[PDB]
Amino acid sequence: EVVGGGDLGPNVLVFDPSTPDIQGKVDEVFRKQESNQFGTDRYALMFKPGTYNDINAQIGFYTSIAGLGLNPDDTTFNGDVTVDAGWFDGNATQNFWRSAENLALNPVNGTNRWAVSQAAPFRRMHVKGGLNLAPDGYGWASGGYIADSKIDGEVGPYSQQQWYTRDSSVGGWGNGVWNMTFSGVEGAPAQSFPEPPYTTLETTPVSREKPFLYLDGDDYKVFVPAKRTNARGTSWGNGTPEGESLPLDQFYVVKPGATAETINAAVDQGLHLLFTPGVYHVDQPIEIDRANTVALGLGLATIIPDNGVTALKVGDVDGVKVAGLLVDAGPVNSETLVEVGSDGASGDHAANPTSLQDVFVRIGGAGPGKATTSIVVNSNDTIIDHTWVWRADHGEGVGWETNRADYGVHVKGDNVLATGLFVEHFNKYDVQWSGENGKTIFYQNAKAYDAPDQAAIQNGDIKGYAAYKVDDSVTTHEGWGMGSYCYFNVNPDIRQQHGFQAPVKPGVKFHDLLVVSLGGKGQYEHVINDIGDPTSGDTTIPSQVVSFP
Ligand SMILES: OC[C@H]1O[C@@H](O[C@@H]2[C@@H](O)[C@H](O[C@@H]3[C@@H](O)[C@H](O)O[C@H](CO)[C@H]3O)O[C@H](CO)[C@H]2O)[C@H](O)[C@@H](O)[C@@H]1O
Ligand SMILES: OC[C@H]1O[C@@H](O[C@@H]2[C@@H](O)[C@H](O[C@@H]3[C@@H](O)[C@H](O)O[C@H](CO)[C@H]3O)O[C@H](CO)[C@H]2O)[C@H](O)[C@@H](O)[C@@H]1O
């Protein structure tokens, strides 16, 4: 039984420098996906190596676009790969669930616009011009994530609240609103927080670039980049990154029809997983318990666990690479949605860690969804490089009970690294860290907006549950460039005692923390523990702590 390789299904639209009506055939997708925030259509747009002209690819919901060279410059657009905000009058605060990878862009007026909020990665791009992250106007925006990219000109966030860039090069960088964090960025502005609120690290401590599909002349393969310790700048500027290249014959090609049983029997049998674009329902976890297994998603491939099961269980193995998957809770509460490693997991994976990359969790919004904890990271050395774990605040099936989700991410492994951590709206602790020697570079949280009252969120004798808690038994932890925002629109008399909670210990340190009330809808009492000013006013002024402790 199981069979690697084959055609990639209807939802992977694959273009070359000759193909007909590329513009009309990219277009059509956009007019279908532009306002389709909670529909089940999914699309991947893939471009063969060469040069494309006259192209302006507006990217809507649940649309990935990428090149199929090894290097960004192998697939060049004279034109744009664009996100803006027309559907929502210029408000970019719901521009979610889309992606761009492995392309070079020569934008038509000199500037590519990528007006995105969360879960909208921009990886391995070469922009031969500037990159604007704001919508036409300077309406609300809440991004964002760039990795492994070279922007020849200026990145211009304008009204973007916050941003994370790693292992990249920019010609310059125009402005900082609340929290612009950089690690391993050539051309980043020097560290300057509080004002302007730039958090700048010379290197990312460990990174490994996300695997991606690409052509060898005409063989579908997947490139699996070689890990980089103390990374700075791009992996591909000096051509060939170290890395090995699985052929697609060694992947099971997931489509509708596939069962959890079938997907499991493939990883078992010795195949990797390529999820083609679609929404998949499963009645038991997808379990990845072979070392070095790549599970790569296309087109915002989405897994929904039925019957309260865990969607994804990774075993206690080295080297697994989960990349490009949206895990969408079912109506029936799952105790966990994603578990990396087993409970009581104990060995190390330093040389060849497991990673989650562009893994997105949603609880609610397309109908009710519920989970107790969304991601449990048990495995030591795991890298979490871009995640958005989101209890819905809008849509259908949202409400304090209707889409209850108490806990977002629980990190129990030791030496876990999060780079680009976005977690929002959980009824209790958005992030909890119980393991040793953890490190987070960039955090973005917003609290739950629908606590019906203060009693709903009493946390023992603390008011509210921290956005980011380090259990007081930890000895060793560090974070950089971290923010928590509140919008208790339902009951704006609520108080949130702090954004962050931790031990007061020599080795449990932070850098550049902030909390923000959005329009005076509730307030924070402090930034971390009992330290830092409360928020005040209705004018959305951040309260900050530069150091801790
Ligand atoms: O021609 C190059 C030029 O393309 C620009 O893309 C624009 C879109 O910004 C725009 O999308 C509109 C909304 O953002 C706007 O506010 O209102 C309506 C309603 O939805 C939208 O059309 O639409 C036109 C065409 O549809 C696009 O060309 C890029 O932003 C820009 O960077 C680029 O230079
Ligand atoms: O609800 C949609 C979406 O909202 C996101 O949070 C937004 C905030 O992004 C937004 O913040 C505004 C700032 O961008 C702007 O600069 O300042 C004004 C104040 O003058 C801010 O309000 O505020 C809205 C609420 O009005 C928030 O909901 C969430 O991150 C996201 O999860 C959510 O889906």
Resolution number, Å:
1.5
Question: How many Cα atoms within 13 Å fall on the side-chain side of residue 460?
Answer: 4
SS (H, E, C) 64-126: EEEECCCCHHHEEEEEEEEECCHHHCCCCCCCCCEEEECCEEECCCCEEEECCCCCCCEECCE
Question: Two tokens at 282?
Answer: 């499963």
Residue 401, classified by CB atoms within 10 Å of its CB into exposed (0-12), middle (13-18) or buried (19+), is: exposed
DSSP notation for 357-425:
EEEEEEESBBS---EEEEEEE-STT-EEEEEEEEE-SSSBS-STTTT---EEEEE-SSS-EEEEEEEE-
Question: Two tokens at 494?
Answer: 């609520």
Q: Is 477 helix (H, G, I), strand (E, B) or coil?
A: strand
**Rounded Cα gap, residues 480 and 183, in angstroms:** 10
Residues belonging to the chain: 549
Q: Is 23 helix (H, G, I), strand (E, B) or coil?
A: helix
Long-range pairs of 128-132 with CB within 8 A, sequence gap ≥ 24: 128/104, 128/152, 129/105, 129/153, 130/154, 130/155, 130/156, 130/171, 131/155, 131/156, 132/156, 132/158
- For residue 113, the CA-to-ligand 1 centroid distance in Å is 9
Q: Which residues contact 244 (CB under 8 A, 6 or more apart)?
A: 224, 226
**Rounded Cα gap, residues 208 and 529, in angstroms:** 34
Judge contact between 168 and 148, C-beta under 8 A: yes
Nearest to 166 by CA among 192, 151, 146, 150: 146
**Rounded Cα gap, residues 478 and 548, in angstroms:** 10
Q: 321 has which bridge partners?
A: 294, 355
Task: Decide whether any atom of ligand 1 lies within 6 Å of the 84 Cβ.
Answer: yes
- For residue 95, the CA-to-ligand 2 centroid distance in Å is 12
Both ends of the chain: CA-CA distance in Å?
Answer: 58
Residue to probe by mutation, ligand 2, list 393, 443, 518, 535, most atoms within 8 Å of CB: 518
- For residue 420, the CA-to-ligand 1 centroid distance in Å is 28
Nearest to 315 by CA among 296, 354, 289, 347: 289
Task: Write the single-letter amino acid at 529.
Answer: N
Q: 376 has which bridge partners?
A: 339, 410
* Experimental method of this PDB entry: X-ray
Q: How far is CA 315 from the centre of its chain?
A: 22
Map out the domains of the chain as residue ranges.
1-247, 248-549
Task: Decide whether any atom of ligand 1 lies within 6 Å of the 109 Cβ.
Answer: yes
**Rounded Cα gap, residues 223 and 546, in angstroms:** 40
The alpha helices in 182-285, defined as continuous H runs, are 260-269
Question: Two tokens at 8?
Answer: 């990639």
**Rounded Cα gap, residues 509 and 184, in angstroms:** 20
**Rounded Cα gap, residues 325 and 63, in angstroms:** 12
DSSP notation for 317-338:
-S--EEEEEEEE--SSPEEEEE
- For residue 341, the CA-to-ligand 2 centroid distance in Å is 34
Nearest CA to ligand 1 atom 34: 109
Q: What is the DSSP letter of 533?
A: P
Q: 483 has which bridge partners?
A: 444, 514
Sign of CA dihedral 166, 168, 169, 170: negative
Task: Write the single-letter amino acid at 407.
Answer: Y
* Helix then strand then coil, % of the chain, to nearest 5: 5, 45, 50
**Rounded Cα gap, residues 405 and 111, in angstroms:** 40
Judge contact between 424 and 449, C-beta under 8 A: no
Task: Decide whether any atom of ligand 2 lies within 6 Å of the 91 Cβ.
Answer: no
**Rounded Cα gap, residues 205 and 231, in angstroms:** 7
